[PDB]
């Protein structure tokens, strides 16, 4: 049973409307499902979009932001709660602490470092929470090819590769996350 | 002027001899160049290989390991120094502190989370040190395709994308890192 899902996503909006459309769909779906959205607390780019969509649908949203980005004034003013913490490391740990699962929408370097870090925490046995990519057109295609090469070349175990789900539909991806177990090897 | 280079690389050896051959070449080259090798301090997989090759060539090697991995007994016993620190976050920060540049050899999830984190630190203006991928056959090919998609889709700025160099030759990659400046946009 999922109750809260942490979403990682770009601080930019992306070069085309498809990214914002996916963000909207994800945000709306989480709220419709009774799930709490946990995220980095921004009002810019896809961060803004996913939070606004969840809020507009009546969902609870918890933003977790380091003081450094907060005084850079990027912080959302309409959330259920906006938690200001001491540093990026504390931020990521808090986000993970409150989440039952993790979803990456498209984003850049920060989105990817968040995802790979939480994934590594799973690999190392710090949590057993599933992760997933919300696919938007072919955005994640080459990353997926790369990630499967890691398994073929034996730098990543099949069971750790299997912590990462994927789907183009928020409903189908959330279903996969909610049901995820190491038993389906 | 580079004096120390931090290398990120797999804790596994990889499915074929090409990975270890590259690691050996990199390690040897750093030492031949008078550069200090900074790394995660392991004796397993490509970590072991790069360190051994640098040591065999007479180079200085500094390993930085969290107490948690140290008491999991993966720590190299023949380095110039092996620094045991408090946590993964401290580890990464120390590694960055001692490094003038960063190189990723092939690896898995941990290698990638290290790389993307240090890259993000650069993007955010915490350091202005270059990063590079040591290419081994077509290993990094799909990652590179993905990374260029991030720029096309405007989730990553061209100037931040340009902090990451690449090369199949340790000599040519180190040359690119040593010379790197934001001016070559």
CSV table of C-alpha atoms in Angstrom, one decimal:
chain,number,residue,atom,x,y,z
A,1,UNK,CA,0.0,0.0,0.0
A,2,UNK,CA,1.4,3.3,-1.2
A,3,UNK,CA,0.4,6.4,0.6
A,4,UNK,CA,3.1,8.9,-0.6
A,5,UNK,CA,5.1,9.1,-3.8
A,6,UNK,CA,8.2,11.3,-4.2
A,7,UNK,CA,8.5,12.8,-7.7
A,8,UNK,CA,11.9,13.9,-9.2
A,9,UNK,CA,11.6,16.2,-12.2
A,10,UNK,CA,13.2,19.1,-14.0
A,11,UNK,CA,13.4,22.7,-12.8
A,12,UNK,CA,12.9,23.6,-16.4
A,13,UNK,CA,9.7,23.1,-18.4
A,14,UNK,CA,11.3,21.4,-21.4
A,15,UNK,CA,11.4,22.3,-25.0
A,16,UNK,CA,7.9,21.2,-25.9
A,17,UNK,CA,4.4,20.9,-24.3
A,18,UNK,CA,4.6,17.1,-23.9
A,19,UNK,CA,6.6,17.4,-20.7
A,20,UNK,CA,4.2,19.7,-18.9
A,21,UNK,CA,1.2,17.6,-20.2
A,22,UNK,CA,2.8,14.5,-18.6
A,23,UNK,CA,3.5,16.4,-15.3
A,24,UNK,CA,-0.1,17.5,-15.2
A,25,UNK,CA,-1.3,14.0,-15.8
A,26,UNK,CA,0.9,12.6,-13.1
A,27,UNK,CA,0.0,15.3,-10.5
A,28,UNK,CA,-3.7,14.9,-11.1
A,29,UNK,CA,-3.5,11.1,-11.0
A,30,UNK,CA,-1.7,11.0,-7.6
A,31,UNK,CA,-4.3,13.3,-6.0
A,32,UNK,CA,-7.2,11.3,-7.6
A,33,UNK,CA,-5.6,8.2,-6.1
A,34,UNK,CA,-5.5,9.7,-2.6
A,35,UNK,CA,-1.6,9.7,-2.7
A,36,UNK,CA,0.5,12.4,-1.1
A,37,UNK,CA,2.9,14.1,-3.5
A,38,UNK,CA,6.4,14.6,-2.0
A,39,UNK,CA,8.8,16.7,-4.1
A,40,UNK,CA,11.6,19.3,-4.0
A,41,UNK,CA,9.2,22.2,-3.3
A,42,UNK,CA,9.8,24.4,-6.3
A,43,UNK,CA,7.5,26.6,-8.3
A,44,UNK,CA,9.6,26.5,-11.5
A,45,UNK,CA,9.5,24.2,-14.5
A,46,UNK,CA,8.0,20.7,-14.2
A,47,UNK,CA,8.3,21.0,-10.3
A,48,UNK,CA,5.7,23.8,-10.4
A,49,UNK,CA,3.5,21.9,-12.9
A,50,UNK,CA,3.3,18.6,-11.0
A,51,UNK,CA,2.6,20.4,-7.7
A,52,UNK,CA,-0.1,22.7,-9.2
A,53,UNK,CA,-1.8,19.8,-10.8
A,54,UNK,CA,-2.0,17.7,-7.6
A,55,UNK,CA,-3.2,20.8,-5.7
A,56,UNK,CA,-5.9,21.7,-8.3
A,57,UNK,CA,-7.2,18.1,-7.9
A,58,UNK,CA,-7.4,18.5,-4.1
A,59,UNK,CA,-4.3,16.4,-3.3
A,60,UNK,CA,-1.9,16.9,-0.4
A,61,UNK,CA,1.6,18.2,-1.4
A,62,UNK,CA,4.7,18.2,0.7
A,63,UNK,CA,7.7,20.2,-0.6
A,64,UNK,CA,11.2,19.6,0.8
A,65,UNK,CA,13.7,22.4,0.0
A,66,UNK,CA,17.2,23.3,1.2
A,67,UNK,CA,17.6,26.8,2.8
A,68,UNK,CA,20.1,27.6,-0.1
A,69,UNK,CA,17.3,27.1,-2.8
A,70,UNK,CA,14.7,28.7,-0.5
A,71,UNK,CA,16.7,32.0,-0.2
A,72,UNK,CA,17.2,31.8,-4.0
A,73,UNK,CA,13.4,32.3,-3.9
A,74,UNK,CA,12.3,29.2,-5.9
A,75,UNK,CA,9.9,27.8,-3.2
A,76,UNK,CA,6.2,27.0,-3.6
A,77,UNK,CA,3.8,29.1,-1.6
A,78,UNK,CA,0.7,27.0,-1.9
A,79,UNK,CA,1.6,23.6,-0.6
A,80,UNK,CA,0.2,21.6,2.2
A,81,UNK,CA,3.7,22.0,3.8
A,82,UNK,CA,7.0,23.3,2.6
A,83,UNK,CA,9.8,21.9,4.7
A,84,UNK,CA,13.1,24.0,4.7
A,85,UNK,CA,16.1,21.8,5.6
A,86,UNK,CA,19.9,22.1,5.9
A,87,UNK,CA,21.5,21.1,2.7
A,88,UNK,CA,20.9,19.0,-0.3
A,89,UNK,CA,21.8,15.8,1.5
A,90,UNK,CA,19.3,16.4,4.2
A,91,UNK,CA,16.7,17.3,1.5
A,92,UNK,CA,17.1,14.0,-0.3
A,93,UNK,CA,17.1,12.0,2.9
A,94,UNK,CA,13.9,13.7,4.0
A,95,UNK,CA,12.2,13.1,0.6
A,96,UNK,CA,13.1,9.5,0.8
A,97,UNK,CA,12.0,9.2,4.4
A,98,UNK,CA,8.5,10.4,3.5
A,99,UNK,CA,8.1,8.4,0.4
A,100,UNK,CA,6.8,4.9,-0.3
A,101,UNK,CA,7.9,5.0,-3.9
A,102,UNK,CA,9.8,7.3,-6.3
A,103,UNK,CA,8.9,8.5,-9.9
A,104,UNK,CA,11.2,10.4,-12.2
A,105,UNK,CA,9.6,12.6,-14.8
A,106,UNK,CA,11.9,14.1,-17.4
A,107,UNK,CA,14.5,16.5,-16.1
A,108,UNK,CA,18.2,17.3,-16.2
A,109,UNK,CA,21.3,16.6,-14.1
A,110,UNK,CA,19.6,17.2,-10.7
A,111,UNK,CA,16.7,14.9,-11.5
A,112,UNK,CA,19.2,12.2,-12.5
A,113,UNK,CA,21.4,12.6,-9.5
A,114,UNK,CA,18.4,12.3,-7.2
A,115,UNK,CA,17.2,9.2,-9.0
A,116,UNK,CA,20.5,7.4,-9.1
A,117,UNK,CA,21.2,8.2,-5.4
A,118,UNK,CA,17.9,6.9,-4.2
A,119,UNK,CA,18.4,3.9,-6.4
A,120,UNK,CA,21.8,3.2,-4.9
A,121,UNK,CA,20.3,3.5,-1.4
A,122,UNK,CA,18.0,0.7,-2.5
A,123,UNK,CA,20.8,-1.4,-3.9
A,124,UNK,CA,22.7,-1.0,-0.7
A,125,UNK,CA,19.7,-2.2,1.4
A,126,UNK,CA,18.8,1.1,3.0
A,127,UNK,CA,15.2,0.9,1.7
A,128,UNK,CA,13.2,-1.5,-0.3
A,129,UNK,CA,11.0,1.1,-2.1
A,130,UNK,CA,10.4,0.9,-5.9
A,131,UNK,CA,11.4,3.5,-8.4
A,132,UNK,CA,9.9,4.3,-11.8
A,133,UNK,CA,10.4,6.4,-14.9
A,134,UNK,CA,7.4,8.2,-16.4
A,135,UNK,CA,8.1,7.9,-20.0
A,136,UNK,CA,7.4,10.8,-22.3
A,137,UNK,CA,7.6,10.0,-25.9
A,138,UNK,CA,11.1,8.6,-26.4
A,139,UNK,CA,12.8,10.8,-23.8
A,140,UNK,CA,14.1,8.0,-21.6
A,141,UNK,CA,14.8,5.5,-24.5
A,142,UNK,CA,18.6,5.9,-24.6
A,143,UNK,CA,18.8,5.9,-20.8
A,144,UNK,CA,16.9,2.7,-20.8
A,145,UNK,CA,19.2,1.2,-23.4
A,146,UNK,CA,22.2,2.3,-21.3
A,147,UNK,CA,20.7,0.8,-18.1
A,148,UNK,CA,20.1,-2.6,-19.8
A,149,UNK,CA,23.8,-2.5,-21.0
A,150,UNK,CA,24.8,-2.2,-17.4
A,151,UNK,CA,23.1,-5.4,-16.7
A,152,UNK,CA,24.5,-7.2,-19.7
A,153,UNK,CA,28.0,-6.0,-18.9
A,154,UNK,CA,27.5,-7.1,-15.2
A,155,UNK,CA,28.0,-3.8,-13.5
A,156,UNK,CA,24.4,-3.9,-12.2
A,157,UNK,CA,22.6,-7.0,-10.9
A,158,UNK,CA,19.3,-8.0,-12.5
A,159,UNK,CA,17.5,-7.7,-9.2
A,160,UNK,CA,18.7,-4.1,-8.7
A,161,UNK,CA,17.9,-3.2,-12.3
A,162,UNK,CA,14.4,-4.6,-11.5
A,163,UNK,CA,13.8,-1.9,-8.8
A,164,UNK,CA,13.2,0.5,-11.7
A,165,UNK,CA,9.8,0.3,-13.4
A,166,UNK,CA,8.6,2.3,-16.4
A,167,UNK,CA,5.4,3.3,-18.1
A,168,UNK,CA,3.9,6.1,-20.2
A,169,UNK,CA,0.7,6.1,-18.2
A,170,UNK,CA,0.7,7.4,-14.7
A,171,UNK,CA,-2.0,4.9,-13.7
A,172,UNK,CA,0.0,1.9,-15.1
A,173,UNK,CA,3.3,3.1,-13.6
A,174,UNK,CA,1.7,3.6,-10.2
A,175,UNK,CA,0.1,0.1,-10.4
A,176,UNK,CA,3.6,-1.4,-11.1
A,177,UNK,CA,5.1,0.5,-8.2
A,178,UNK,CA,2.3,-0.4,-5.7
A,179,UNK,CA,2.7,-4.1,-6.6
A,180,UNK,CA,6.5,-4.3,-6.9
A,181,UNK,CA,8.2,-7.0,-5.1
A,182,UNK,CA,11.7,-8.6,-5.5
A,183,UNK,CA,9.9,-12.0,-6.1
A,184,UNK,CA,9.0,-11.1,-9.7
A,185,UNK,CA,12.7,-11.4,-10.6
B,1,UNK,CA,47.4,22.6,-13.9
B,2,UNK,CA,45.9,19.4,-12.6
B,3,UNK,CA,47.6,17.7,-9.7
B,4,UNK,CA,45.0,15.2,-8.5
B,5,UNK,CA,42.2,13.4,-10.5
B,6,UNK,CA,39.3,11.6,-8.8
B,7,UNK,CA,38.2,8.5,-10.6
B,8,UNK,CA,34.7,6.9,-10.3
B,9,UNK,CA,34.4,3.3,-11.5
B,10,UNK,CA,32.6,0.0,-10.9
B,11,UNK,CA,33.0,-2.2,-7.9
B,12,UNK,CA,32.6,-5.0,-10.3
B,13,UNK,CA,35.1,-6.0,-13.0
B,14,UNK,CA,32.7,-6.1,-15.9
B,15,UNK,CA,31.8,-8.9,-18.2
B,16,UNK,CA,34.8,-8.7,-20.5
B,17,UNK,CA,38.6,-7.9,-20.2
B,18,UNK,CA,38.2,-4.5,-22.0
B,19,UNK,CA,37.1,-2.7,-18.8
B,20,UNK,CA,40.1,-3.9,-16.7
B,21,UNK,CA,42.4,-3.1,-19.7
B,22,UNK,CA,41.1,0.5,-19.7
B,23,UNK,CA,41.4,0.8,-15.9
B,24,UNK,CA,45.0,-0.3,-16.1
B,25,UNK,CA,45.7,2.1,-18.9
B,26,UNK,CA,44.1,5.0,-16.9
B,27,UNK,CA,45.9,4.2,-13.6
B,28,UNK,CA,49.2,3.8,-15.3
B,29,UNK,CA,48.8,7.0,-17.2
B,30,UNK,CA,47.9,9.1,-14.2
B,31,UNK,CA,51.0,7.9,-12.3
B,32,UNK,CA,53.3,8.5,-15.4
B,33,UNK,CA,51.9,12.0,-15.6
B,34,UNK,CA,52.7,12.7,-11.9
B,35,UNK,CA,49.0,13.0,-11.0
B,36,UNK,CA,47.6,11.8,-7.7
B,37,UNK,CA,44.8,9.3,-8.0
B,38,UNK,CA,41.9,10.0,-5.7
B,39,UNK,CA,39.2,7.3,-5.5
B,40,UNK,CA,36.8,5.4,-3.3
B,41,UNK,CA,39.4,3.2,-1.7
B,42,UNK,CA,38.3,-0.3,-2.7
B,43,UNK,CA,40.2,-3.4,-3.6
B,44,UNK,CA,37.3,-4.9,-5.7
B,45,UNK,CA,36.4,-4.7,-9.4
B,46,UNK,CA,37.7,-1.8,-11.4
B,47,UNK,CA,38.4,0.2,-8.2
B,48,UNK,CA,41.1,-2.4,-7.4
B,49,UNK,CA,42.4,-2.4,-10.9
B,50,UNK,CA,42.9,1.3,-11.3
B,51,UNK,CA,44.5,1.7,-7.9
B,52,UNK,CA,46.9,-1.3,-8.5
B,53,UNK,CA,47.9,0.0,-11.9
B,54,UNK,CA,48.7,3.5,-10.5
B,55,UNK,CA,50.6,2.0,-7.6
B,56,UNK,CA,52.6,-0.4,-9.8
B,57,UNK,CA,53.7,2.6,-11.8
B,58,UNK,CA,54.9,4.4,-8.7
B,59,UNK,CA,52.0,6.9,-8.4
B,60,UNK,CA,50.4,8.3,-5.3
B,61,UNK,CA,46.9,6.9,-4.5
B,62,UNK,CA,44.5,8.3,-1.9
B,63,UNK,CA,41.4,6.2,-1.1
B,64,UNK,CA,38.4,7.7,0.6
B,65,UNK,CA,36.0,5.2,2.1
B,66,UNK,CA,33.0,5.4,4.5
B,67,UNK,CA,33.2,3.5,7.8
B,68,UNK,CA,30.3,1.4,6.6
B,69,UNK,CA,32.1,0.0,3.5
B,70,UNK,CA,35.4,-0.2,5.5
B,71,UNK,CA,33.8,-2.6,8.1
B,72,UNK,CA,32.4,-4.5,5.1
B,73,UNK,CA,36.1,-5.1,4.5
B,74,UNK,CA,36.4,-3.9,0.9
B,75,UNK,CA,39.2,-1.3,1.7
B,76,UNK,CA,42.6,-1.2,-0.1
B,77,UNK,CA,45.6,-2.0,2.1
B,78,UNK,CA,48.4,-0.7,-0.1
B,79,UNK,CA,47.5,2.9,-0.8
B,80,UNK,CA,49.4,6.0,0.0
B,81,UNK,CA,46.6,6.8,2.4
B,82,UNK,CA,43.2,5.4,3.0
B,83,UNK,CA,40.9,7.9,4.6
B,84,UNK,CA,37.9,6.5,6.6
B,85,UNK,CA,35.1,9.0,6.9
B,86,UNK,CA,31.6,9.2,8.3
B,87,UNK,CA,29.1,8.4,5.6
B,88,UNK,CA,28.7,8.4,1.8
B,89,UNK,CA,28.0,12.2,1.7
B,90,UNK,CA,31.2,13.0,3.6
B,91,UNK,CA,33.0,10.5,1.3
B,92,UNK,CA,31.9,12.3,-1.9
B,93,UNK,CA,32.6,15.7,-0.5
B,94,UNK,CA,36.2,14.7,0.5
B,95,UNK,CA,36.8,13.1,-2.9
B,96,UNK,CA,35.7,16.3,-4.6
B,97,UNK,CA,37.7,18.4,-2.1
B,98,UNK,CA,41.0,16.7,-3.1
B,99,UNK,CA,40.4,16.5,-6.8
B,100,UNK,CA,41.2,19.0,-9.6
B,101,UNK,CA,39.1,17.0,-12.1
B,102,UNK,CA,36.9,13.9,-12.3
B,103,UNK,CA,36.9,10.8,-14.6
B,104,UNK,CA,34.2,8.1,-14.8
B,105,UNK,CA,35.4,4.7,-16.1
B,106,UNK,CA,32.6,2.2,-16.7
B,107,UNK,CA,30.6,1.2,-13.6
B,108,UNK,CA,27.1,0.8,-12.3
B,109,UNK,CA,24.6,2.7,-10.2
B,110,UNK,CA,27.1,4.0,-7.7
B,111,UNK,CA,29.5,5.2,-10.4
B,112,UNK,CA,26.6,7.1,-12.0
B,113,UNK,CA,25.3,8.6,-8.8
B,114,UNK,CA,28.8,9.9,-8.0
B,115,UNK,CA,29.3,11.4,-11.4
B,116,UNK,CA,25.9,13.1,-11.6
B,117,UNK,CA,26.2,14.5,-8.1
B,118,UNK,CA,29.6,16.0,-8.7
B,119,UNK,CA,28.4,17.3,-12.0
B,120,UNK,CA,25.4,18.9,-10.3
B,121,UNK,CA,27.8,20.6,-7.8
B,122,UNK,CA,29.5,22.1,-10.8
B,123,UNK,CA,26.3,23.3,-12.4
B,124,UNK,CA,25.3,24.9,-9.1
B,125,UNK,CA,28.6,26.8,-8.9
B,126,UNK,CA,30.1,24.9,-6.0
B,127,UNK,CA,33.3,24.1,-8.1
B,128,UNK,CA,34.5,24.7,-11.6
B,129,UNK,CA,36.3,21.4,-12.1
B,130,UNK,CA,35.9,19.4,-15.3
B,131,UNK,CA,34.5,15.9,-15.6
B,132,UNK,CA,35.1,13.3,-18.2
B,133,UNK,CA,34.0,9.9,-19.4
B,134,UNK,CA,36.7,7.3,-20.3
B,135,UNK,CA,35.0,5.6,-23.2
B,136,UNK,CA,35.4,1.8,-23.5
B,137,UNK,CA,34.2,0.5,-26.8
B,138,UNK,CA,30.6,1.7,-27.0
B,139,UNK,CA,29.8,1.4,-23.4
B,140,UNK,CA,28.9,5.1,-22.8
B,141,UNK,CA,27.3,5.6,-26.3
B,142,UNK,CA,23.6,5.5,-25.2
B,143,UNK,CA,24.3,7.6,-22.2
B,144,UNK,CA,25.9,10.2,-24.4
B,145,UNK,CA,22.9,10.1,-26.8
B,146,UNK,CA,20.7,10.6,-23.7
B,147,UNK,CA,22.8,13.5,-22.4
B,148,UNK,CA,22.7,15.3,-25.7
B,149,UNK,CA,18.9,14.9,-25.7
B,150,UNK,CA,18.8,16.7,-22.4
B,151,UNK,CA,20.4,19.7,-24.1
B,152,UNK,CA,18.1,19.5,-27.2
B,153,UNK,CA,15.1,19.3,-24.9
B,154,UNK,CA,16.4,22.2,-22.8
B,155,UNK,CA,16.7,20.5,-19.4
B,156,UNK,CA,20.4,21.0,-19.4
B,157,UNK,CA,22.2,24.2,-20.5
B,158,UNK,CA,24.9,23.8,-23.2
B,159,UNK,CA,27.5,25.3,-20.9
B,160,UNK,CA,26.8,22.7,-18.2
B,161,UNK,CA,26.7,19.9,-20.8
B,162,UNK,CA,30.2,21.1,-21.8
B,163,UNK,CA,31.7,20.4,-18.4
B,164,UNK,CA,31.7,16.8,-19.4
B,165,UNK,CA,34.5,15.7,-21.7
B,166,UNK,CA,35.0,12.3,-23.3
B,167,UNK,CA,37.8,10.2,-24.9
B,168,UNK,CA,38.9,6.6,-25.4
B,169,UNK,CA,42.5,7.5,-24.7
B,170,UNK,CA,43.5,8.4,-21.1
B,171,UNK,CA,46.1,10.8,-22.5
B,172,UNK,CA,43.7,12.7,-24.8
B,173,UNK,CA,40.9,12.8,-22.1
B,174,UNK,CA,43.4,14.1,-19.4
B,175,UNK,CA,44.6,16.7,-22.0
B,176,UNK,CA,41.0,17.9,-22.5
B,177,UNK,CA,40.4,18.0,-18.7
B,178,UNK,CA,43.6,20.0,-18.0
B,179,UNK,CA,42.8,22.5,-20.7
B,180,UNK,CA,39.0,22.8,-20.0
B,181,UNK,CA,37.6,26.2,-19.7
B,182,UNK,CA,34.0,27.6,-20.0
B,183,UNK,CA,35.3,29.9,-22.8
B,184,UNK,CA,35.3,27.1,-25.3
B,185,UNK,CA,31.5,27.1,-25.4
